[PDB]
């Protein structure tokens, strides 16, 4: 695992970088880069990746989604909650954001928090 693996990483990384260099619009390359990272388990890398992608297009429901999906599958539950509240702050009229926020809060048990986030939510009727 010294350098054959490491150079395979170097290659795939340089590729994804060049594809997003060409477009840096449509996001499938951003995602696939990031999920490749998460599968190699470097969530710091993958984190910066999702922040940059979110910069170029902060109106992407799937981007927000799979960002937080990474955070939840890796249970940085605090990090995940920060993600969810930022989401529902910037794209409130998207509903599945609110939903997944609650559902995760519920299997977390903090139903006081779930109540107050539903109060938030209903402020938008």
């Amino acid at each position: 695992d010294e350098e054959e693996l490491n150079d395979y990483k170097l290659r795939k990384r340089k590729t994804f970088e060049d594809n997003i260099r060409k477009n840096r619009t449509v996001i499938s390359n951003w995602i696939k880069y990031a999920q490749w990272e998460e599968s190699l388990k470097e969530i710091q890398r993958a984190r910066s990746i999702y922040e940059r992608a979110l910069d170029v297009d902060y109106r992407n429901i799937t981007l927000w989604l799979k960002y937080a999906e990474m955070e939840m599958k890796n249970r940085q539950v605090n990090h995940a909650r920060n993600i969810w509240d930022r989401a529902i702050t910037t794209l409130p009229r998207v509903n599945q954001f609110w939903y997944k926020y609650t559902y995760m809060e519920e299997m977390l048990g903090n139903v006081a928090g779930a109540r107050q986030v539903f109060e938030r939510w209903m402020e938008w009727q």
């Binding site: 350098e3 054959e4 150079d7 290659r11």
Partner: protein
Amino acid sequence: KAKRKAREKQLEEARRLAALQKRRELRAAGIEIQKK
């Protein structure tokens, strides 16, 4: 165009292969020379 670039999709990997197999055996032989 399309299908040509499919041909070097592998024969490129042989190059890093023939770079790998030489150099792993090379540098393990007792010489840590870097390309540059």
